[PDB]
């Protein structure tokens, strides 16, 4: 039942449902930001509480409710006379819509604080899920302070126009909802880690921040204009600011917000193609704001420049290494054929994402993950070497750990006859061929997964011939061999005496047969 | 007594009181900067020395003292006639306030030069505190030159309006106080090192620098305007510059400073929404200044971009390593379950600030601090291993030096039965459990501080069973083991023969019992 379910329920913060929940809370938070400030400053978003009265010349000049032709080409700004009921009779639908969305976002906040109440914390690697423990951890922490301050329903009594007590509402009392920024920061970071484009996403959330700052600065500009007085000088929004209200432009709520947003965009991006301040207070406001806009522009430039620098760092490092090679081959007077070979191979493995090293896995991962990855890649290929057929899998784990990559280019010789042989080669991503002394392919091409040199790695007596390679091997195209050194194999064998017995016996039997 | 105290007193420059003193000296220095230049250029900050006379049409046009309605909508700039006593009778209170603050800051300078006189210097690690020595070091150095030049009381005779000799003061003679910038630079660096936000603090002191430069450039703009003549053209402050003095704006000292600061902000940030120069000298000034403003804007952008690049360097490096791992696991065709395991573990220790290495302590600290830190973390946990109970603490210091961290993820196996055992594990930050061959937890979970494998690390004969693990151990959650290799223990033991005897005896006794 829902009773027992909500009685015993606890939350795990690392789920995929909890991430979606943090996204929902972020939606509610953005709602609060934008529309609390907008409803405070503009306050026609809920419907006008007052009636705009314009002085109109019909017979004679009288004061009547402004039409849209009275709000165009104004010679003075209209005056307002409140309604008896502060617009409630004719805008109750707009105000009920606003109340519904406020209640929806506060229900989101209540669900979020319930999930914080029953919140599983990580103790000794595990996530604790015993309710008693999570609620005790909640109460011992001071999360309930922030969860309660951010939900104080003060804006439901004093945030709306009450005509009985002649109270015209204070929508700014909902700014305590903006204290739950911790879950928004988590959602943004958990989205950055999941994003297939983290640099782009970082710059995108920065421009979202800048757009929200432009919105708040637009509201600040219009609040300062309304406090000073609209149409009083050529800087505040009004009829004397001929950029606010040009010739055939009507003074509407959309016009107020649109011009304020444009003004704020021009100021905070340091473009400044807006009217100059007139009064000392406007000069102070605009100076401070232009300094904030210099800092905002510098922040945008810095974030975009950091993104550009990060996304071109690998190419830069590759170019540095290639230029070092070029400079060396010029200082030491290297033949041009070898130089074009070097440059061809460099460009080849730059157009194939190779990095020439297992050092990423080696450095950054723990030995457990490194061993598991090496076992996945190399074990089933090292189980078919015909000397490792019946030896302990721990030996093969040790070996698959010590497998060194070697790359080759077309026509390169892996080994020539009469050439000390201290190695075993496992073919990946290529095709070798054994040749009769720079002649025709004699017997076989080595496709992927094949091995060559598995018997020149054991120290058997006499054999038939030295520690000399005895065969020619050249790559047809670009091969990617994996190399098992002799010292590494013999270390792993000194760790395993019975494996050494089996290996030596099988090698001797292979050579005799 | 104060006599003996000041006779024998010497100063240690590394105290917390001396840092507060450098902050006081920085306050005095900033006072000098701002208000010496402001009092030179504007010089109504001490009270007007002259009387502004306006041509006023009452009956007829006469020249009378300007009111505030005569300084609005001016058709020409007012003319000035000095007082007999240069405003002293009616502004002696303002001038006495200025004199008091000047004397206060010069007392700060005198205390500072006394502390420089009795200044303890660092000689052979210690701070010398013998007065004779510190005063001899002061006199042998040439600090007294700067301490004396910066305190020359020339501005007390020639810096104020003297009506007897018709001298109107030269407040710029106090610019020698601006030579003590060394203590200001120390205070700023000592505050940067103490600051919990060094990047933010660096950018903040840079914007303080920019605000001071804007202040000095505002004073320079108004001094050039006054030298050319006020109201002579449409670039200098005055009545022909309709941005300085719009319609209903009064010409006051506040207006002069406010407009000059706004002009300087627009010029030095390369916004340039100010009137164009009219004369060749104004063109030269504005060109040079706009070039300085280009450099200032580039400096702001560079500092903010450097702060942004520094504070996102760890995330960038982590992302580079994770992308390298992804690219490797795509090139080698790794199973997707292992890839989601790898990514989960990566994100886990990126959301826990782990860094997987003790290499910070290893690289950057001296062996003394490294040994002390390792002793604090590991000694009391290595004293309870039941083989290290009665062995020399030097052996255990050697050991706590060589303890390697190993991390594990939930369900990972630390060791399986029949698995070469060359190691000892010390549990931290996790909980293991021994299991009956992938079945149920058999006997015990290993909470933190527990040890496993302490007997598979000694080379005792026969024992009961090999060097084989003999037990299964898997982590319940994310465990953080500490690993004591066999080679390291046996090196530390070869350094200690008696410790080896005790260890082998106790191991044999443990196994027999
Ligand atoms: C989104 C839209 C939702 C549904 C309807 C929006 C109605 C658009 C306004 C109608 C024009 C009235 C007008 O024109 O503006 C005003 C002001 O009212 C408004 O702005 C209300 C705007 C918003 C209303 C409700 C929005 C609630 C939305 C919830 C927030 C969004 C949540 C995000 C989701 C999580 C009414 O003017 P008036 O004709 O009374 O005054 C002048 C008459 N003289 C000049 C001719 C004489
Ligand atoms: C936005 C909706 C666009 C409405 C377009 C047509 C309405 C119309 O066309 O009606 C407008 C009247 O105002 C309105 O009710 C529209 C209400 C929209 C007010 C915008 C205030 C928004 C504050 C929102 C915060 C936003 C967060 C943004 C963060 C970046 C009359 O139009 P008029 O001035 O073109 O001339 C008429 C002759
Ligand atoms: C800070 C404030 C400290 C206390 C008082 C400040 C008084 C404010 C000025 C009164 C308005 C007079 C006026 O309005 O401006 C002027 C100029 O005098 C001043 O500016 C003096 C400003 C500063 C005075 C003393 C400041 C000493 C502060 C020490 C520095 C701060 C140190 C930082 C701390 C380490 C007087 O004008 P008037 O009426 O004689 O001329 C026009 C008359 N017609 C037009 C109607 C005919
Ligand atoms: C600053 C104090 C604000 C005073 C506001 C009200 C005074 C007033 O309101 O009185 C002003 C008169 O000038 C004053 O004495 C105020 C003296 C302030 C002069 C500012 C010069 C400051 C140079 C300071 C260096 C500052 C370092 C800054 C570094 C970034 C009259 O006012 P009004 O022009 O508005 O019109 C009247 C009709
Ligand atoms: C730089 C200093 C700028 C001078 C600011 C100033 O003079 O105006 C004081 C304002 C009220 O001024 P007004 O609204 O009468 O023009 O009232 C206020 O100052 C509000 C407080 C913010 C300052
Ligand atoms: C006023 C200027 C502040 C603009 C605000 C832009 C902003 O908030 O983005 C900050 C970004 C990095 O943010 P984050 O990575 O900490 O989430 O980049 C920054 O941290 C730079 C902000 C500091 C500017 C001074
Ligand atoms: C670029 C060169 C710009 C030309 C400068 C110039 O012509 O004017 C010389 C000024 C005096 O000029 P004015 O005050 O008579 O206009 O007198 C001075 O030049 C002062 C010295 C600084 C130059
Ligand atoms: C004229 C442009 C000079 C602007 C002055 C801004 C400034 O002084 O800040 C300098 C900062 C670093 O200063 P600091 O770290 O040496 O204290 O950053 C710089 O060093 C850049 C100043 C050099 C600009 C050329
Ligand atoms: Na312009």
PDB file of N, CA and C in Angstrom, chain B residues 250-302:
ATOM      1  N   UNK B 250      22.467  70.711 -12.960  1.00  0.00           N
ATOM      2  CA  UNK B 250      23.205  71.789 -12.320  1.00  0.00           C
ATOM      3  C   UNK B 250      24.695  71.491 -12.324  1.00  0.00           C
ATOM      4  N   UNK B 251      25.494  72.519 -12.590  1.00  0.00           N
ATOM      5  CA  UNK B 251      26.945  72.398 -12.577  1.00  0.00           C
ATOM      6  C   UNK B 251      27.437  72.437 -11.138  1.00  0.00           C
ATOM      7  N   UNK B 252      27.743  71.273 -10.581  1.00  0.00           N
ATOM      8  CA  UNK B 252      28.246  71.154  -9.224  1.00  0.00           C
ATOM      9  C   UNK B 252      29.538  70.349  -9.239  1.00  0.00           C
ATOM     10  N   UNK B 253      30.202  70.300  -8.085  1.00  0.00           N
ATOM     11  CA  UNK B 253      31.414  69.499  -7.953  1.00  0.00           C
ATOM     12  C   UNK B 253      31.115  68.020  -8.138  1.00  0.00           C
ATOM     13  N   UNK B 254      29.989  67.562  -7.597  1.00  0.00           N
ATOM     14  CA  UNK B 254      29.573  66.182  -7.809  1.00  0.00           C
ATOM     15  C   UNK B 254      29.360  65.900  -9.286  1.00  0.00           C
ATOM     16  N   UNK B 255      28.764  66.843 -10.013  1.00  0.00           N
ATOM     17  CA  UNK B 255      28.549  66.644 -11.440  1.00  0.00           C
ATOM     18  C   UNK B 255      29.866  66.563 -12.191  1.00  0.00           C
ATOM     19  N   UNK B 256      30.830  67.415 -11.837  1.00  0.00           N
ATOM     20  CA  UNK B 256      32.132  67.380 -12.491  1.00  0.00           C
ATOM     21  C   UNK B 256      32.804  66.034 -12.297  1.00  0.00           C
ATOM     22  N   UNK B 257      32.854  65.554 -11.054  1.00  0.00           N
ATOM     23  CA  UNK B 257      33.506  64.271 -10.833  1.00  0.00           C
ATOM     24  C   UNK B 257      32.734  63.126 -11.473  1.00  0.00           C
ATOM     25  N   UNK B 258      31.407  63.164 -11.418  1.00  0.00           N
ATOM     26  CA  UNK B 258      30.605  62.064 -11.939  1.00  0.00           C
ATOM     27  C   UNK B 258      30.746  61.972 -13.451  1.00  0.00           C
ATOM     28  N   UNK B 259      30.654  63.105 -14.143  1.00  0.00           N
ATOM     29  CA  UNK B 259      30.807  63.072 -15.588  1.00  0.00           C
ATOM     30  C   UNK B 259      32.224  62.702 -15.989  1.00  0.00           C
ATOM     31  N   UNK B 260      33.234  63.169 -15.250  1.00  0.00           N
ATOM     32  CA  UNK B 260      34.599  62.812 -15.599  1.00  0.00           C
ATOM     33  C   UNK B 260      34.849  61.326 -15.406  1.00  0.00           C
ATOM     34  N   UNK B 261      34.307  60.744 -14.338  1.00  0.00           N
ATOM     35  CA  UNK B 261      34.452  59.313 -14.112  1.00  0.00           C
ATOM     36  C   UNK B 261      33.735  58.508 -15.186  1.00  0.00           C
ATOM     37  N   UNK B 262      32.566  58.972 -15.627  1.00  0.00           N
ATOM     38  CA  UNK B 262      31.854  58.281 -16.696  1.00  0.00           C
ATOM     39  C   UNK B 262      32.619  58.360 -18.013  1.00  0.00           C
ATOM     40  N   UNK B 263      33.097  59.553 -18.368  1.00  0.00           N
ATOM     41  CA  UNK B 263      33.914  59.722 -19.562  1.00  0.00           C
ATOM     42  C   UNK B 263      35.114  58.789 -19.541  1.00  0.00           C
ATOM     43  N   UNK B 264      35.813  58.741 -18.409  1.00  0.00           N
ATOM     44  CA  UNK B 264      37.007  57.919 -18.301  1.00  0.00           C
ATOM     45  C   UNK B 264      36.680  56.434 -18.360  1.00  0.00           C
ATOM     46  N   UNK B 265      35.545  56.027 -17.796  1.00  0.00           N
ATOM     47  CA  UNK B 265      35.122  54.639 -17.909  1.00  0.00           C
ATOM     48  C   UNK B 265      34.841  54.268 -19.357  1.00  0.00           C
ATOM     49  N   UNK B 266      34.158  55.145 -20.092  1.00  0.00           N
ATOM     50  CA  UNK B 266      33.855  54.846 -21.486  1.00  0.00           C
ATOM     51  C   UNK B 266      35.102  54.846 -22.354  1.00  0.00           C
ATOM     52  N   UNK B 267      36.096  55.654 -22.014  1.00  0.00           N
ATOM     53  CA  UNK B 267      37.294  55.719 -22.844  1.00  0.00           C
ATOM     54  C   UNK B 267      38.225  54.552 -22.551  1.00  0.00           C
ATOM     55  N   UNK B 268      38.451  54.245 -21.276  1.00  0.00           N
ATOM     56  CA  UNK B 268      39.410  53.211 -20.923  1.00  0.00           C
ATOM     57  C   UNK B 268      38.868  51.801 -21.094  1.00  0.00           C
ATOM     58  N   UNK B 269      37.571  51.638 -21.312  1.00  0.00           N
ATOM     59  CA  UNK B 269      37.004  50.348 -21.673  1.00  0.00           C
ATOM     60  C   UNK B 269      36.714  50.249 -23.161  1.00  0.00           C
ATOM     61  N   UNK B 270      37.148  51.239 -23.939  1.00  0.00           N
ATOM     62  CA  UNK B 270      37.026  51.261 -25.397  1.00  0.00           C
ATOM     63  C   UNK B 270      35.580  51.205 -25.862  1.00  0.00           C
ATOM     64  N   UNK B 271      34.659  51.716 -25.053  1.00  0.00           N
ATOM     65  CA  UNK B 271      33.283  51.869 -25.506  1.00  0.00           C
ATOM     66  C   UNK B 271      33.140  53.139 -26.330  1.00  0.00           C
ATOM     67  N   UNK B 272      33.621  54.258 -25.798  1.00  0.00           N
ATOM     68  CA  UNK B 272      33.783  55.459 -26.585  1.00  0.00           C
ATOM     69  C   UNK B 272      32.517  56.182 -26.950  1.00  0.00           C
ATOM     70  N   UNK B 273      31.450  56.024 -26.179  1.00  0.00           N
ATOM     71  CA  UNK B 273      30.213  56.736 -26.463  1.00  0.00           C
ATOM     72  C   UNK B 273      30.250  58.131 -25.859  1.00  0.00           C
ATOM     73  N   UNK B 274      31.300  58.880 -26.162  1.00  0.00           N
ATOM     74  CA  UNK B 274      31.513  60.213 -25.606  1.00  0.00           C
ATOM     75  C   UNK B 274      31.719  61.171 -26.768  1.00  0.00           C
ATOM     76  N   UNK B 275      31.549  62.474 -26.540  1.00  0.00           N
ATOM     77  CA  UNK B 275      31.771  63.440 -27.619  1.00  0.00           C
ATOM     78  C   UNK B 275      33.145  63.291 -28.256  1.00  0.00           C
ATOM     79  N   UNK B 276      33.220  63.645 -29.521  1.00  0.00           N
ATOM     80  CA  UNK B 276      34.462  63.558 -30.263  1.00  0.00           C
ATOM     81  C   UNK B 276      35.348  64.755 -29.947  1.00  0.00           C
ATOM     82  N   UNK B 277      36.666  64.591 -30.030  1.00  0.00           N
ATOM     83  CA  UNK B 277      37.558  65.725 -29.813  1.00  0.00           C
ATOM     84  C   UNK B 277      37.348  66.783 -30.877  1.00  0.00           C
ATOM     85  N   UNK B 278      37.718  68.014 -30.538  1.00  0.00           N
ATOM     86  CA  UNK B 278      37.544  69.148 -31.429  1.00  0.00           C
ATOM     87  C   UNK B 278      38.878  69.735 -31.862  1.00  0.00           C
ATOM     88  N   UNK B 279      39.831  69.838 -30.952  1.00  0.00           N
ATOM     89  CA  UNK B 279      41.119  70.451 -31.216  1.00  0.00           C
ATOM     90  C   UNK B 279      42.204  69.392 -31.332  1.00  0.00           C
ATOM     91  N   UNK B 280      43.338  69.799 -31.896  1.00  0.00           N
ATOM     92  CA  UNK B 280      44.432  68.865 -32.138  1.00  0.00           C
ATOM     93  C   UNK B 280      44.964  68.288 -30.836  1.00  0.00           C
ATOM     94  N   UNK B 281      44.998  69.097 -29.778  1.00  0.00           N
ATOM     95  CA  UNK B 281      45.506  68.622 -28.499  1.00  0.00           C
ATOM     96  C   UNK B 281      44.534  67.623 -27.877  1.00  0.00           C
ATOM     97  N   UNK B 282      43.232  67.854 -28.048  1.00  0.00           N
ATOM     98  CA  UNK B 282      42.240  66.896 -27.580  1.00  0.00           C
ATOM     99  C   UNK B 282      42.306  65.608 -28.381  1.00  0.00           C
ATOM    100  N   UNK B 283      42.584  65.707 -29.680  1.00  0.00           N
ATOM    101  CA  UNK B 283      42.762  64.510 -30.494  1.00  0.00           C
ATOM    102  C   UNK B 283      43.956  63.700 -30.024  1.00  0.00           C
ATOM    103  N   UNK B 284      45.071  64.365 -29.725  1.00  0.00           N
ATOM    104  CA  UNK B 284      46.242  63.652 -29.230  1.00  0.00           C
ATOM    105  C   UNK B 284      45.953  62.968 -27.902  1.00  0.00           C
ATOM    106  N   UNK B 285      45.338  63.704 -26.970  1.00  0.00           N
ATOM    107  CA  UNK B 285      44.998  63.131 -25.675  1.00  0.00           C
ATOM    108  C   UNK B 285      44.080  61.928 -25.824  1.00  0.00           C
ATOM    109  N   UNK B 286      43.029  62.051 -26.635  1.00  0.00           N
ATOM    110  CA  UNK B 286      42.047  60.982 -26.737  1.00  0.00           C
ATOM    111  C   UNK B 286      42.617  59.785 -27.483  1.00  0.00           C
ATOM    112  N   UNK B 287      43.488  60.012 -28.464  1.00  0.00           N
ATOM    113  CA  UNK B 287      44.115  58.893 -29.159  1.00  0.00           C
ATOM    114  C   UNK B 287      45.005  58.102 -28.212  1.00  0.00           C
ATOM    115  N   UNK B 288      45.836  58.716 -27.478  1.00  0.00           N
ATOM    116  CA  UNK B 288      46.647  58.074 -26.562  1.00  0.00           C
ATOM    117  C   UNK B 288      45.941  57.405 -25.557  1.00  0.00           C
ATOM    118  N   UNK B 289      44.918  57.920 -25.016  1.00  0.00           N
ATOM    119  CA  UNK B 289      44.064  57.324 -24.082  1.00  0.00           C
ATOM    120  C   UNK B 289      43.285  56.203 -24.578  1.00  0.00           C
ATOM    121  N   UNK B 290      42.764  56.195 -25.757  1.00  0.00           N
ATOM    122  CA  UNK B 290      42.125  55.072 -26.313  1.00  0.00           C
ATOM    123  C   UNK B 290      43.075  54.017 -26.550  1.00  0.00           C
ATOM    124  N   UNK B 291      44.312  54.213 -26.842  1.00  0.00           N
ATOM    125  CA  UNK B 291      45.283  53.127 -26.935  1.00  0.00           C
ATOM    126  C   UNK B 291      45.569  52.524 -25.562  1.00  0.00           C
ATOM    127  N   UNK B 292      45.718  53.372 -24.542  1.00  0.00           N
ATOM    128  CA  UNK B 292      45.829  52.863 -23.178  1.00  0.00           C
ATOM    129  C   UNK B 292      44.590  52.071 -22.779  1.00  0.00           C
ATOM    130  N   UNK B 293      43.416  52.483 -23.246  1.00  0.00           N
ATOM    131  CA  UNK B 293      42.202  51.758 -22.923  1.00  0.00           C
ATOM    132  C   UNK B 293      42.114  50.417 -23.618  1.00  0.00           C
ATOM    133  N   UNK B 294      42.631  50.328 -24.841  1.00  0.00           N
ATOM    134  CA  UNK B 294      42.738  49.037 -25.512  1.00  0.00           C
ATOM    135  C   UNK B 294      43.618  48.102 -24.700  1.00  0.00           C
ATOM    136  N   UNK B 295      44.751  48.610 -24.215  1.00  0.00           N
ATOM    137  CA  UNK B 295      45.629  47.763 -23.410  1.00  0.00           C
ATOM    138  C   UNK B 295      44.989  47.376 -22.081  1.00  0.00           C
ATOM    139  N   UNK B 296      44.228  48.285 -21.472  1.00  0.00           N
ATOM    140  CA  UNK B 296      43.560  47.989 -20.206  1.00  0.00           C
ATOM    141  C   UNK B 296      42.469  46.944 -20.397  1.00  0.00           C
ATOM    142  N   UNK B 297      41.681  47.081 -21.459  1.00  0.00           N
ATOM    143  CA  UNK B 297      40.668  46.087 -21.779  1.00  0.00           C
ATOM    144  C   UNK B 297      41.296  44.727 -22.048  1.00  0.00           C
ATOM    145  N   UNK B 298      42.412  44.705 -22.778  1.00  0.00           N
ATOM    146  CA  UNK B 298      43.107  43.449 -23.020  1.00  0.00           C
ATOM    147  C   UNK B 298      43.626  42.847 -21.723  1.00  0.00           C
ATOM    148  N   UNK B 299      44.053  43.688 -20.782  1.00  0.00           N
ATOM    149  CA  UNK B 299      44.514  43.183 -19.492  1.00  0.00           C
ATOM    150  C   UNK B 299      43.375  42.567 -18.688  1.00  0.00           C
ATOM    151  N   UNK B 300      42.215  43.222 -18.668  1.00  0.00           N
ATOM    152  CA  UNK B 300      41.060  42.662 -17.970  1.00  0.00           C
ATOM    153  C   UNK B 300      40.656  41.333 -18.584  1.00  0.00           C
ATOM    154  N   UNK B 301      40.565  41.288 -19.915  1.00  0.00           N
ATOM    155  CA  UNK B 301      40.188  40.053 -20.591  1.00  0.00           C
ATOM    156  C   UNK B 301      41.209  38.962 -20.312  1.00  0.00           C
ATOM    157  N   UNK B 302      42.495  39.311 -20.310  1.00  0.00           N
ATOM    158  CA  UNK B 302      43.522  38.313 -20.072  1.00  0.00           C
ATOM    159  C   UNK B 302      43.490  37.759 -18.666  1.00  0.00           C
TER     160      UNK B 302
END
